[PDB]
């Protein structure tokens, strides 16, 4: 008798989703284990509403574990979930971008096992995609938004290790506290083509707005953004130049039910491996922890048995920090109609792209000279021109 619940906030896709996911584990099972399910949903959510629900549900049906889903991309709700799971020593696995927004992780006492790409894993693809068309990573502009220290350090090490190319020149940061043209002063001091930035969504609107005034939104420039920038939405804000490169997890063609079914299997199979190995009973807490938490502390957790899960044709093994080593990264662009369109896929450490050479289409209108980017034809001949195979 395993327990599970799903939550949906400000969504209109839950009612049928719960029933379809309900019949899933019955056949997906390959072990004569047991499964019980329940579903719920709520409107615009707050920490107080979140915390009240979890023990109300836990005290009701003696919850073995829960799966979480929310949206709107709030940094706060990320730090809200984890510390709840920390004290109650219950395995909680939340699966969606709002929950999957990256965090610096907490003490090993917690059992959260986040479901998304790491900062290092995300960045290394961003640096690698440069090796395709645009040569040198030119500029890095960042605010004081958390997580910058790990980012600028990782890229600096990997650029000074490989000898090939990669002549990074200028890296700058801006103080939002001085919200005036003083930022434009520091911003005006970089001249190059490809600009890489790492900031929050709200500041992204302002900084790109300032650049359009000076002219960095021109036809000759390329902007590269990580996943967290506007990834978890379908309604793009204004001031974003038409034409943008991001590597995100949004998984255009995937379904939450598909993700939930995989998540459910991670719960049951891993616990099945530990329980059957040593006749282990997953002793539940008598309530949410006021006093009765201590006797269950000596009981061994599922961490030795939850790191490795199989089936569904994907090595879903986690790590110490809770980021997968076989994620489903995709790269996506802003088309002419302000509607995001998939471009290429990342799988088994390769850059498969539907585009061979860059499309080079314009920014937001009323600014389009477009008189550059010449094409050249050449013949292989005597030492004027020589051809060779790629090393």
């Amino acid at each position, epitope marked *: 008798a395993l327990n599970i619940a799903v939550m949906l906030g400000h969504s209109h896709d839950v009612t049928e989703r719960e029933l379809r996911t309900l019949w899933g584990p019955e056949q997906a099972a390959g072990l004569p284990l047991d499964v019980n399910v329940v579903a719920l949903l709520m409107n615009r959510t707050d920490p107080k509403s979140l915390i009240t629900h979890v023990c109300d549900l836990m005290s009701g049906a003696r919850i073995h574990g829960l799966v979480f889903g929310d949206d709107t991309d709030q940094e706060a709700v990320a730090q809200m979930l984890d510390f709840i799971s920390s004290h109650t020593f219950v395995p909680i696995l939340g699966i969606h971008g709002g929950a999957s927004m990256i965090m610096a992780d907490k003490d090993p006492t917690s059992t959260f096992f986040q479901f998304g790409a790491s900062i290092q894993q995300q960045a290394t693809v961003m640096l690698k995609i440069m090796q395709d068309y645009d040569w040198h990573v030119f500029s890095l502009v960042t605010t004081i938004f958390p997580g910058y220290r790990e980012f600028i350090s990782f890229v600096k090490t990997t650029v000074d290790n490989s000898f090939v190319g990669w002549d990074m020149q200028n890296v700058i940061t801006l103080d939002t506290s001085f919200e005036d043209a003083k930022t434009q002063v520091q911003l005006k001091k970089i001249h190059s083509s490809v600009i890489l930035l790492y900031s929050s969504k709200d500041e992204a609107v302002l900084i790109l707005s300032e650049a359009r005034s000076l002219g960095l939104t021109g036809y000759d420039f390329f902007w590269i953004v990580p996943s967290l920038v506007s990834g978890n939405t379908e309604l793009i804000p204004k001031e974003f130049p038409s034409g943008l490169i991001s590597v995100s997890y949004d998984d255009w063609d995937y379904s939450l039910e598909a993700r939930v079914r995989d998540g459910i299997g991670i719960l049951t199979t891993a616990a099945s491996s530990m329980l059957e190995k040593f006749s282990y009973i997953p002793e539940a807490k008598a309530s949410c922890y006021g006093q009765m938490e201590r006797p269950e502390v000596p009981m061994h957790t599922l961490h030795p048995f939850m790191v490795n899960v199989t089936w569904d044709g994907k090595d879903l093994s986690f790590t110490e920090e809770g980021y997968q080593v076989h994620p489903r990264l995709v790269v996506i662009v802003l*088309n*002419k109609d302000r509607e995001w*369109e998939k471009v290429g896929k990342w799988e088994n450490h390769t850059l498969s792209l*539907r*585009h*061979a*050479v860059w*499309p*080079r*289409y*314009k920014s937001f209108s009323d600014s389009e000279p*477009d*008189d550059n980017h010449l*094409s050249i034809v050449t013949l292989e001949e005597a030492p004027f021109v020589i051809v060779e195979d790629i090393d």
Partner: nanobody
Amino acid sequence: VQLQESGGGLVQAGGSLRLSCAASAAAAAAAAAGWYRQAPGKERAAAAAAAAAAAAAAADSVKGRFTISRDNAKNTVYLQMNSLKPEDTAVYYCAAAAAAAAAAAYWGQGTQVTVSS
């Protein structure tokens, strides 16, 4: 990618027509669009072209009879042809090249234009 040509028919000499070729794609800014003609007994021949920059080249053979135009907003290139002569009887084709891709020569089903008395 796939295109589609249309606009043909029968028109008396000295008349006019409006041929059109269209294709679906999100990058439609950057494609060379060319018109090809191939009559019975003759090799395929170029007629009119449009560049990515926005320049127009017209073949000297039948220069001045027709004109080319491209709409950046809507993915369709249509060819406005005027002062028809019997020498123009053929099946006109539309094509694109470059901005990615491979196996680069793209040909529609074909539209036959007939000029006669």
